[PDB]
Amino acid sequence: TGMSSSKRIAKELSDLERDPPTSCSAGPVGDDLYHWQASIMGPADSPYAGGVFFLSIHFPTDYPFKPPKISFTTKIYHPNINANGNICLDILKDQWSPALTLSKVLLSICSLLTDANPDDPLVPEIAHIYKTDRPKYEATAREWTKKYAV
């Protein structure tokens, strides 16, 4: 019959339309409620300021007991985001909660763009630069922002 995961998504969708989307935006791709396309703005605090980053969201059939498959569409230069757009966010894997909404996740992504975690990196090459030559990291991150996200 009716899926439990189907209702949880619909409820969050209602809360996102009632409340102001603010510095974010997310909606279901076409008709499928399990395929979403998000779009968050780069924080001013971060070197990703001025850029708009698009994401691909795939909800599982046993949502919210499992995290949605979230990845980046826009090429981004980050120690915890690789070339495929996959995010090394703790709250996504092994720290997930059925109470955590998509809004909380997208906000956590913003909080990751501002303050990365080179201690647990997804891209060693960038994390190495982040630790040894932060000025070089900041420059490249802005160059990619103005080239891909703008």
Partner: protein
């Protein structure tokens, strides 16, 4: 909002509204509760304060 399970969006019964599986006060359905504890992939703790069920 109120009188609804925050996980499966189902009407909370009279047997569910008086069910406090965690001392924090976070309330979920009897089915969502058992789902968390039993499912092999799930951790089996409160979605709020991550306190283990007993």
């Amino acid at each position: 909002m109120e009188d609804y399970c925050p996980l499966c969006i189902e009407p909370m019964d009279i047997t569910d509204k008086n069910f406090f599986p965690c001392p924090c006060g976070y309330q979920i359905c009897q089915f969502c509760y058992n789902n968390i504890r039993q499912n092999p992939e799930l951790n089996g703790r409160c979605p709020a304060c991550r306190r283990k069920y007993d």
